Amino acid sequence: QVQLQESGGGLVQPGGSLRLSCAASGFTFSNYKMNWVRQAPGKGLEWVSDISQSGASISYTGSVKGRFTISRDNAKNTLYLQMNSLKPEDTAVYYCARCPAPFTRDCFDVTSTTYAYRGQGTQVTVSS
Amino acid sequence: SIAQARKLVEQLKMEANIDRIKVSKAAADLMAYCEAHAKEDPLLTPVPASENPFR
Amino acid sequence: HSDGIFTDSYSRYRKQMAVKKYLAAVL
Amino acid sequence: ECRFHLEIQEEETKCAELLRSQTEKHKACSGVWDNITCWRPANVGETVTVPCPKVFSNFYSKAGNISKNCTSDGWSETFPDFVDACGYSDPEDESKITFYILVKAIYTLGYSVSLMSLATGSIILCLFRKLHCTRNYIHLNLFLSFILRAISVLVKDDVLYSSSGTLHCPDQPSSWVGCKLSLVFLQYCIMANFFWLLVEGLYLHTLLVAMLPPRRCFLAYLLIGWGLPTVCIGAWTAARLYLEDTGCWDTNDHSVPWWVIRIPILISIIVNFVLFISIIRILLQKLTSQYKRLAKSTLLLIPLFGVHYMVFAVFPISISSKYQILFELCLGSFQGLVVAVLYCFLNSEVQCELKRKWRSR
Amino acid sequence: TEDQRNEEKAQREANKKIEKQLQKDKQVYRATHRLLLLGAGESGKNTIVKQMRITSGIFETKFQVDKVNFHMFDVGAQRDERRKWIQCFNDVTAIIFVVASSSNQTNRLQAALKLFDSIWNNKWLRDTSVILFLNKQDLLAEKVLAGKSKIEDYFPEFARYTTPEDATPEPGEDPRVTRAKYFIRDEFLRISTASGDGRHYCYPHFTCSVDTENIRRVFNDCRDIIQRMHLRQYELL
Amino acid sequence: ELDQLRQEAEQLKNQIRDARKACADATLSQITNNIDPVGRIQMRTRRTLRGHLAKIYAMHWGTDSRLLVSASQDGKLIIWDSYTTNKVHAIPLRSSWVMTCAYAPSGNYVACGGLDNICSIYNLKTREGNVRVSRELAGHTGYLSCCRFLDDNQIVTSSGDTTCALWDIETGQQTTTFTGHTGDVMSLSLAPDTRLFVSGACDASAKLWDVREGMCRQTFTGHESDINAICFFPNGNAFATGSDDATCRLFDLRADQELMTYSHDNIICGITSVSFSKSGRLLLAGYDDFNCNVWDALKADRAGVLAGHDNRVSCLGVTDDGMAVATGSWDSFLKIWNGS
């Protein structure tokens, strides 16, 4: 059974650093590209960043790049998201999402309402 | 929501209350069916061309 | 075309050789 | 063989044999067979001046005549020398023969190898059912036109310039009709090849310009490929049967039969060059919005259209026609091989199909 | 064999009739271009198709330009799970991808960029060309001249961007407007040209969703696609 | 409220998987060591059916193992005669984007459906002499991916709206609706007794339904990507399924657990169609690397390859008597294959 469990999150002060971890099971980690998406309160699902099979190719959404970093550990089958220097507009539920099929580069569906290969998510809040 | 979660929970409870059969018995059943109908399988043992309708 | 040009030229040359041999024989 | 001179010499010998058969009154200078003329007996005190024989008309550097004085004892000697009056005057011609032979070898090889390619190329487009598109049908017809051209050239060379026989060359007309049909086959094959080179460019231009091609286009192409030469060839035959039935139709003397076959070929060459320019314009427009790709595509498209014939079609005939022969006949005898290599062997689709067939077995 | 000759003859005649009708259908089929209209609900896709015209899971539009038939299909009552039914459109002449140049709910331009990246790199759509409609140009015009927007922040590399030399601005246009336009166009072309390989091509256009030139843009781009396909069959490209 | 409910659903799942682990003590591969391999399976193309313009996307054999229907994306539903290669019918479809074929077991009707979300039922007996749309079942909100006749009067359909539905052609109404999947439902297979059917979905799960009462009985989760094809074993106690993770799997209903995985290291392409031989010893799987291949269901090693297609194999079907295998492909060609 394919499942993705997200850990971390919580409430942190603006400008602080917080770490998100993603433990995967039920599929081969290496041959799947994966990514981080998020849902703001009252908004829709939006794509944050993605990392390829080997971790060589990385991309971020514009409002994030320069702040967050991602890395995958195929030995531990775990995805990471480092969120240093947070901003008040980063409060959202973060979902670790998986690519639909292996050995692909298009990787259509991530930010859908009822996507299957997606985790439950962790709430990240920044306030003072 | 609550409705979807409770539907999933009751479906899982239905899944729990089902009978149990050993996988060895299932494997034996599959093997027995395969060996019983082996001679009636044209793809396993090709039929002579006299009664092959795709000659 | 070039095939016709070559054929015509070669036929004329062969006739030249034949007539030259004949004229050498008679004279 | 080109032994019509022997036949006409025998005719002119029977001229003297028959016209002097009667014997009614012996003259001072009785008719004899000498100086290759039908001498007529003449009485005392007459001078017989006759033109040099028309049989050697092509062989004269001057319009001269031979004069003889008639005497009671007979004709003593010809005052003007034949070599001096109407001689060959060709001292350097003895070394041209090798050149002809050399050329006759080279293009022969060309046609040979071209044949050995085109034929097998044809079966690759015939055996495999995936390759049954209109473009490959046009390519197949072009290959067949090349094959016919090579076969006709080889047959003409065998008929006219052979050495296997004794070269007796009988006067019976069946051989003459045979070699005339050989030359007609040559002309038809050459013109059909030119028209299929035209049809290739016509189809490519229609694909690139018409956003939807006509449904019954290929049929029309077939006519242009094969029906159009026939009519022209027929016209040529009529001319050869009316204006100059001189001998075997391997020599062009009268201008009308030469132009009858020269005009359609020149028109096809010009139109193909225009279509080539248009296609290169379209390709440049697409490549601009690299120049090595454009050059490679132009060089790849040159053999399929036969645009090298444009080099000598517009150039005036002032280089003794030896350079035109050496370029066109010799080099372009390999055009069939080049076309087969480019559009049947290095074609990616047919190569992948051949790989699939090879791995299947 | 007396009772089976007649039925075999009847089958042969029926097959001949079917083959004649199928030849007619093939002639009809090969003369029309199928287009897939794709986009979001907040773009000008519906307005564009309504101008072109002037429950069901698929919507159909027939329009004829220069005696050439065009058969454009719009996605109807379908979910946002395009994984499986996108493969039905791998043999169309083009996918007209309409994107609203305005980045509000969220960064919808980023979602459109991700969708274009997915379409471009799909193994079944790798031979299908995309006609890109950078729709809603008037919103760009009256949004970047309003003083503040969400493009300089949501795309940090826009600050260090200069207008391309080959740009062709419309007369009487602020340089900021054309800078933003060509920045978005280059954002799409960055991922378009990264994996093209000559199999398929992208045709960006600045559209406004209300004009008579969009149908002509589609016609010209389809002509270019067909010509490039023909030139590829001859290994001239 | 939701946190505790999720935390107890997860321990229900843990109990289920513990029961599965208790069931699994002997593997099917180990118990099949005593049997002999089937050897190399050589199959040859006997017929090639031409006539479709665009890609063939679905296909279905008739009960007489002679006639077969096939759907093409150009909008054609062609009924062939496989013995003589003659075309029996050439039904033109209202919507070109067809994705499924069904052939009524009695042979009187043929079904189709696709991106129009409509299941069209065509009468083939033609009391007036022409094939006409007998019915148009509407009510799905996704797209029709599969449909199979229970009989002349009933049909079960699979939709992209994450739902299956059992209809009544006489009244044209959804007699019952099967829900519970998460992703698109891509295929369905009817049990031989027509009392249960399995469906594979885009959530990487297969699901078994009882037709007459209408609720899920068992859920099978062994695949890691979306399921494209599913088929029952001949005796109805097991079923095979293929997915985009380049693996086929066999599940047993009574054991309620995956039994065997058919995969190779050199295959990285998805599996589009799955079928079983007459005895169930051979499992034929169509791949989108342009060719089919034949596994043996008991040894999990490839026994043959069906390589004749120039594009991806979309559909695959074995006759009721097991004499021939039809393969359809995106190259618009239909091929009949038989043993030597």
Residue numbers in the entry:
A (entry chain N): 1 to 128
B (entry chain G): 8 to 62
C (entry chain L): 1 to 27
D (entry chain R): 24 to 312, 322 to 393
E (entry chain A): 9 to 62, 204 to 252, 261 to 394
F (entry chain B): 3 to 342
Please quote the paper that reports this structure.
Considering that such N-terminal modification reduced both the production of cAMP and the ligand-binding ability of our VIP2R construct, we built a complete wild-type (WT) construct VIP2R(1-438) without any tags and retained the native signal peptide. After sample preparation, cryo-EM data collection and analysis, 3D consensus density maps were reconstructed with a global resolution of 3.4 Å for the PACAP27–N-terminal modified VIP2R(24-438)–Gs and 2.7 Å for the PACAP27–VIP2R(1-438)–Gs complexes, respectively. Considering the higher resolution feature and native-like signaling profile of the PACAP27–VIP2R(1-438)–Gs complex, structural analysis of VIP2R was performed based on this model. The most profound structural feature resides in the upper half of the PACAP27-bound VIP2R showing a position and orientation of the ECD N-terminal α-helix distinctive from all available class B1 GPCR structures reported to date. Specifically, the tip of the N-terminal α-helix moved down toward the TMD by 13.8 Å relative to that of PAC1R (measured by the Cα of E24 in VIP2R and D23 in PAC1R) and inserted into a cleft between PACAP27 and the ECL1. The inserted N-terminal α-helix stabilizes the peptide and ECL1 conformations via multiple contacts including two salt bridges (R14P and E24ECD, K37ECD and D194ECL1), two hydrogen bonds (E24ECD and S185ECL1, E30ECD and C192ECL1) and several hydrophobic contacts (R14P and C25ECD, K15P and H28ECD, Y22P and Q32ECD, F27ECD and W1993.26b). S2P forms one hydrogen bond with E3607.42b of VIP2R, such an interaction is neither found in VIP1R (K3697.38b) nor in PAC1R (R3817.38b).
Vasoactive intestinal peptide (VIP) and pituitary adenylate cyclase-activating polypeptide (PACAP) are two important neuropeptides that exert a variety of physiological actions through three class B1 G protein-coupled receptors (GPCRs), namely PACAP type 1 receptor (PAC1R), VIP receptors 1 (VIP1R, or VPAC1) and 2 (VIP2R, or VPAC2). Among them, vasoactive intestinal polypeptide receptor 2 (VIP2R) is expressed in the central and peripheral nervous systems and involved in a number of pathophysiological conditions, including pulmonary arterial hypertension, autoimmune and psychiatric disorders, in which it is thus a valuable drug target. Here, we report the cryo-electron microscopy structure of the human VIP2R bound to its endogenous ligand PACAP27 and the stimulatory G protein. The PACAP27–VIP2R–Gs complex adopts a typical architecture of the activated class B1 GPCR conformations, characterized by a single straight helix of PACAP27 that interacts with both ECD and the transmembrane domain (TMD), a sharp kink in the middle of the TM helix 6 (TM6) thereby opening the cytoplasmic face, and the insertion of the C-terminal α5 helix of the Gαs into the receptor core.
